[PDB]
Design a protein around this ligand. Structure first.
Ligand SMILES: [Mn+2]
Ligand SMILES: [Mn+2]
Ligand SMILES: [Mn+2]
Ligand SMILES: [Mn+2]
Ligand SMILES: [Mn+2]
Ligand SMILES: [Mn+2]
Lengths: 566, 100, 101, 566, 566, 100
């Protein structure tokens, strides 16, 4: 028949042309396309469409999806469209029109007896976040991150030890094997980084052979040109990524010396702004090179009123510095610059910085990677208006540019984009369902490998799952063997060949990293800008093409006091 | 006491309500979680006193007003649900549009 | 400012366009109410509903997906039907066709 | 010598002829028999009987029980007797007189070095409950149910997804395999139900071959006569049970059409009263047929002052209905009838309804199955007095009739009575110890497969296990491998043959279901009544043999505000 | 250059000659030696020593330690020295000078790429405690004990059952196998004790063959001379230890009869003072014999103002006694003697009592074994001054004597000293890091088998691990397979040979007990005194060599209200 | 409410603070854990009110004095740290030598 657009949205979610506000921000998205056939939408419930002989067919399991997310508003680097998502064998099967081919038209995602259903109408579906800057200080970090919407965690550490507090390094074979084993107990995909600070290649190769998918070069372990060059040599020959936290003291040379030692080889620079570490005060200039994949740690995102006051003490504790030792306090202060902190926000908006990470419990907040990326986006719209690439009256391009920062780009940088990072067929089903009012803050459902791992849950004894108190509790996807079957442990090609998974008797699915050496700044989705950026050695001012880059500190932000109890 | 898992879970709701209750007292405009906890705890004590389900479904809408919570909060809470032990056992109370 | 608010553009959606339809007068002769779904094969509804079943062959209700049409005891009303598509193979319901048509 | 009856009861628990009040209800039980030899009772403690050469013998492990529950007051469908319970190899060894044959008379349960002891004097021992209507919405439901005294859980679901919120279905091979694996992490015996709504038999057979012990036909997935007939055909050939939630809308026909499609084949009707779903308004008439095994979901048990007011909203949320869509609200209201709600209580008291279940978080409370069954029993005594079958001045028969509702009868209906459901030799040792003051409400000890899985526990650091705070905490029977060894995963005969347990690498004990097709209304212990019941299509009045059936709503109930903190 | 002693201590911890106060007690320790080379200390942090080519070398994993604890103040029975601790393969590698041999002198513990670092400067490192008197009433006891600093737990039980409430016995093969399996889920090294009360040797041998590392003889199961002699015969032939709780009632004879039945064979007497059980009122005289290894349970340590008032009710509940039964209350009172309670404190100070244990939830507090041993030490210094063995102006000898009570001595007594009990090369890396202000009360880090298992942890979402709230949370060493690899399950030589670990499919590391029969009072480190002790049958006065032994009850104690919230 | 693990963790700090707050009220000299909980809870409510980080780093040192806590307690707390949601998001507050 005919139905008004409003009633339609209330029933099946927004369609082409409708706009939606992301949480309590100023960001608006507009549905670019809708893959449904009007009047043929599948809906589940009493007397609804998905029923035998109607929206559900007679095909066997092999011929129908296992899980269907009906009427989903997909937000991904590739588009903001309305469609049905099909999941088969723990992987993204198709993005199309679900239903029964027997009686419905254009059905690309067949629903059968074997098909479970998740109603996504009026919700936003995104890929699970990927944090490539984890400090394994405590296992409780995984639950915190999973609840925020991050399904993959890469980093290093052995627990609450001095080395791990300061650096993302799982030192050597024994600690690597132990962490690889302990990873099985965690509801997130994991990848370990070893200590790359050594001038003897065999000491690095053993670690890669033991299982790490990358090597962290950290100044606390001595980020000298010899160490850097050494890690990059082994990386080049084993197809693993190198993450760098450069020499803040300028002890072995300045930023240009580090850049020279790197020698145009692929590398991931952590906290490229510098507050989290790096050559004082211009490590930020690294974002200008093609072999550099730059990222920001979250405490400096976005520039706000209390950012500076907060940073000094935070610096001290993480790096085991002494507030009484003059040299220890001067080097901490040379690290915090209002100038570079303000510029970072803008450099993100332009696509000069390509990733966002946490730096969990070592100058970073594990559950605020997504939340802060959107707070930056909001502030940049407010201050700088629409991007040059925007089309139409929405912020669709700014959303694609920012979502890619914690999804696809991190996945490309660490060589796991073939497995995760986006909602594309063939990729593991790591999805997150959000209610528009809580986007980026508190997820409605967090799916892992095709099974819900964590979700808000009310009174276990209630007559429905909605009565208070409602708080995040672990679901079946996080239980014993189901968990193993729904998570990935990323290994290096070498470790895989050596049969490390068999020797350690790892129970989860194994995935291998590849393509870490060939990625470059230009491959970073929507964030490939290489600016002619300069930093004034005295005033610390950041300039791109001579023009001054800067922003103002926010006094109030969205996705903050309106959603949290504390 | 022999506290079951559900009695222990409601202790969380009660504690969350003490937080909101103190803030409302300082004259703050309550946020989302604060509002939910405050109205939910109200209904539980309602059941403890012996008030009927019907009575509470009404009174629950007069706990917090639109001028006592932050902007957008009322629209974020289309309804509030909580279960408590009434004299005639556990019952579900649904308060529609609690904040007006 | 309302968190997550929609800004639906005004207008209407035309449902099931370009498909054969037909009207049928239906009467509930039963003593109990009957409610029919949007994608249910009309020709196989509760036997208490009196109508030309022959015309409703391979048809369903021309109503927005997921909605229903109720019939109180003794109720009589005219409904609009729209033709099944896809393979036009009806399986299930009361098992009167179980195949194409 | 001689000892007064009172002092005797205070020392060894009540004996033949003594009466005990169940919690704070009006129900009284009277010890029908005592299997001890007066003066020869075994008691454990300092200077007590169970000691080397005295109440403990010299026999090897193979010749003595592993666990003995001394002086237990057994309450089961078969009797209310005082005896010692012996447990060997995780199973009920014997119900008799424990001790040392060397010096004591009539010892049937030998106590040796290998014998652990649980003092049950002054306590009531019952079999563990069996809930055959579980919605696997969250794993936390198992702990809630175990604490209430239910040791076996049958149902379906994949977690907090639309399909599971509404129906008890684990859709297809993949989700089945995943749930079967996740089941190992749970402290209760489990059995899964697949989605039976399909008109192609092969789609059902795969699910049975994948591991389900039953098929749920639900109206939300289309409970048409074709779907029903299809599920029953496969059930008949694979010896699995079918649970039905009929067509409330009368869309495909009335209750008589559904009954006709069933065609005199065995079937389990969920919430036969109808409020939880079913042909409006007479699905309740199904309890009159011999092939129908009827059960009630707990929110309507018993009829009270707030029952009605509560139901409307509860209905909406579970089935994903819309309060604004007229058709969605009319069908919810046509489901709630004061008339049938009142009649249900009485139909139970008579033995017309044979089971009680929860319908966890989908119009049911997981931890109130036992609690509500007894509240119904109490209210029925109060309103209707003694049953025609009562003998003596006690409620012994009413207790046997009601306890069977959540123990043996559910076990018979789903083909697992050979493994659990009652305290009979050979059955798995799933027992629950209760203090008379907390019967049906809060258990003293919950034993699983011979090991305590959960119990009230005080200050872990205290000098004794009794100091506050005391709340239920998991014990050894719920830990890793001990748990696997103490729980059962019920498979279908087909899945067992296909080696599903080996392929999925399930670690728990495996049990197979059988005898699902041959059970009938007449086999339901103490609940085999087939009444000539009619429902008025207009007034909704329920009549048995023309006489009106009804009861009054309670304003206050026992096992409620006197025991709970919230 | 030159640095003042104060600034030196603030930077690297105290050195030779400095004194440190243990928590808020009157006990002072003085650094006896320092194994470092001044100016060559290794320190980790930004710009610190442990960096590539500096304090970190180029050697492969096989040639460097996995974990190094820098600048640790070691407190052990063998000395109170300042040194670096190296850990390799989960075991104590060396106690020396860590660093890079390439540029540093006297490096005995090489630091390489594979080396993780824990900063211990300004902290006290000790071996993990060993409680040989555990009642497995609930699994939650392990976390409580681990947090207090006890890494090994020996005892028996099947959970919250009458037998376990009263005695430390895991009755027979089935319950033994079940507990051995459940032990894998626990973060502490475990060893089980079987029920040794039987006069048929084969009934004891089966239990030893099933896996117990000892046999508990308890009066509640009949501690007759026949039972005692029987257990000792099997112990002698299978190299397992026997723990005894003698006949309090004097039913089978007096203390001398028990001593005679023992017949000069090795044995561990639990709660030798008697309040926790034993021949009334002189079981305390057992500490005079060479074959007796005496220990105290913690509630009577130390003698305080409320000790007596507390004991009567505690007695009743544990042993299932009746306050109304005269004989049950008289025997409880005959057990509590102010006289022997006061003497116990002094007998410890002298080295007559050699061990301290808990007796968890059966007249003992699981998390107060360490805490109470030090409270006794403090009170003894206060009352009796320096020991005859003290040298210098410190309490170094009293600390070595008392620490051995819950570390090495318990390890020797139960035949596991080859695996744990002290900080010596080759032993498993079960270490505990303490801050001087919280010594004996709340640990900074608890390491198990080379991995941190539990530690104080702040806000998981914070930017550093220190923000509130800070409370003990489990770390990686307590997760799945990592846990299995870091813990030990002690088996009897027989069970090991029978392939019990393979049959039960135990996943943890297996260790075997040996040398249980050959240990004697003289082998107890710093606690080998065999006093000519007598107890007056009437007045209960304890006398050693005719002189009266006694102490006064404390009104206030350290490590109490200053550290606890409740 | 949809409480995350961190909001639930802060409920522990808040409850611990209620304990200390009541004891201080009876006029007791607070111990170690009590002091930490009391000052930490003070700062959280500071953020809720909207006070800046700098303001709190100061005010936090005037919550409890040396004569309100047991002997040795001030020296056991060289600094106090807690994070809360300020109007501009989560921030870290470090109070040095809170007790004087
Ligand atoms: Mn860094
Ligand atoms: Mn970092
Ligand atoms: Mn139903
Ligand atoms: Mn249901
Ligand atoms: Mn004892
Ligand atoms: Mn004991």
């Amino acid at each position: 028949s005919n139905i008004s657009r409003q009633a339609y949205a209330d029933m099946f979610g927004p369609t082409v042309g409708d706009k939606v506000r992301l949480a309590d921000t100023e960001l608006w998205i507009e549905v670019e396309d809708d893959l449904t056939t009007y009047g043929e939408e599948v809906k589940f419930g009493g007397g609804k469409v998905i029923r035998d002989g109607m929206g559900q067919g007679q095909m066997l399991a092999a011929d129908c999806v296992d899980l269907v997310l009906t009427n989903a508003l997909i937000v991904d680097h590739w588009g903001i469209v309305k469609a049905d998502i099909g999941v088969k064998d723990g992987r993204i099967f198709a993005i199309g029109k679900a239903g029964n081919p027997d009686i419905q038209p254009n059905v690309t995602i067949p629903i059968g007896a074997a098909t479970e259903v998740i109603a996504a109408e009026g919700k936003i579906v995104t890929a699970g976040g990927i944090d490539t800057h984890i400090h394994w200080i405590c296992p409780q970090q995984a639950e915190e991150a999973l609840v925020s919407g991050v399904t993959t965690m890469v980093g290093g550490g052995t627990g609450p030890a001095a080395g791990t507090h300061a650096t993302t390094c799982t030192p050597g074979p024994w600690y690597i094997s132990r962490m690889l084993q302990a990873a099985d107990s965690l509801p997130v995909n994991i990848g370990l980084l070893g200590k790359g600070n050594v001038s003897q290649p065999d000491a690095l190769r053993e670690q890669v052979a033991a299982g790490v998918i990358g090597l962290k070069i950290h100044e606390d372990w001595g980020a000298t040109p010899a160490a850097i060059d050494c890690a990059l040599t082994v990386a080049d020959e084993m197809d693993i990524q190198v993450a760098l936290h450069s020499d803040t003291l300028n002890e072995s040379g300045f930023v240009e010396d580090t850049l020279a030692a790197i020698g145009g080889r692929t590398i991931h620079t952590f906290h490229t702004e510098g507050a989290g570490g790096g050559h004082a005060p211009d490590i930020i200039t690294a974002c200008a090179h093609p072999n550099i994949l730059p990222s920001s740690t979250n405490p400096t995102l976005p520039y706000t009123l209390n950012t500076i006051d907060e940073h000094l003490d935070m610096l001290m504790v993480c790096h085991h510095l002494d507030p009484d030792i003059a040299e220890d306090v001067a080097f901490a202060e040379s690290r915090i610059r209002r100038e570079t902190i303000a510029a970072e926000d803008v450099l993100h908006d332009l696509g000069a910085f390509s990733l966002t990470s946490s730096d969990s419990q070592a100058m970073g907040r594990v559950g605020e990677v997504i939340l802060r990326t959107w707070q930056v986006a909001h502030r940049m719209k407010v201050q700088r208006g629409a991007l040059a690439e925007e089309t139409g009256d929405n912020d669709n391009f700014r959303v694609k540019r920012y979502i890619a920062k914690y999804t696809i780009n991190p996945a490309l940088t660490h060589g796991i984009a073939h497995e995760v990072g986006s909602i594309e067929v063939g990729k593991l089903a790591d999805l997150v369902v959000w209610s528009p009012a809580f986007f980026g803050v508190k997820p409605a459902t967090v799916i892992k490998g095709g099974m819900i791992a964590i979700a808000p849950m009310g009174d276990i004894n209630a007559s429905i799952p909605t009565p208070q108190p409602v708080h995040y509790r672990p679901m079946f996807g996080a239980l014993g063997s189901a968990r193993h079957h729904c998570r990935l442990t990323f290994l290096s090609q070498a470790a895989a060949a050596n049969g490390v998974a068999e020797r350690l008797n790892l129970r989860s699915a194994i995935a291998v990293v590849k393509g870490c050496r060939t990625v470059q700044k230009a491959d970073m989705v929507h964030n490939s800008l290489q600016p002619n950026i300069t930093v004034d050695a005295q005033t610390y001012e950041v300039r791109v093409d001579g023009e001054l880059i800067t922003s103002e500190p926010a006094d109030v932000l969205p996705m903050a006091q309106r959603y949290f109890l504390f | 006491m022999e506290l079951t898992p559900r009695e222990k879970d409601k202790l969380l709701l009660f504690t969350a309500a003490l937080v909101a209750e103190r803030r409302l007292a300082r004259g703050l405009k309550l946020n989302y979680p604060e509002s939910v906890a405050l109205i939910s705890a109200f209904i539980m004590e309602g059941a403890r006193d012996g008030k009927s389900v019907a009575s509470l479904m009404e009174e629950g809408r007069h706990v917090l007003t639109r001028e006592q919570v932050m902007e957008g909060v009322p629209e974020m809470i289309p309804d509030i649900q909580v279960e408590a032990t009434f004299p005639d056992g556990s019952k579900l109370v649904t308060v529609h549009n609690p904040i007006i | 400012m309302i968190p997550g608010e929609y800004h639906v553009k005004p207008g209407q959606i035309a449902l099931n366009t370009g498909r054969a339809t037909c009207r049928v007068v239906v009467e509930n002769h039963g003593d109990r109410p009957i409610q029919v779904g949007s994608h249910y094969h009309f020709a196989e509804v509760n036997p208490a509903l009196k109508f030309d079943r022959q015309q409703a062959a391979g048809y369903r209700l021309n109503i927005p997906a997921g909605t229903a049409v109720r019939f109180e005891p003794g109720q009589k009303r005219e409904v609009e039907l729209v033709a099944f598509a896809g393979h036009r193979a009806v399986f299930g319901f009361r098992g009167e066709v179980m195949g194409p048509l």
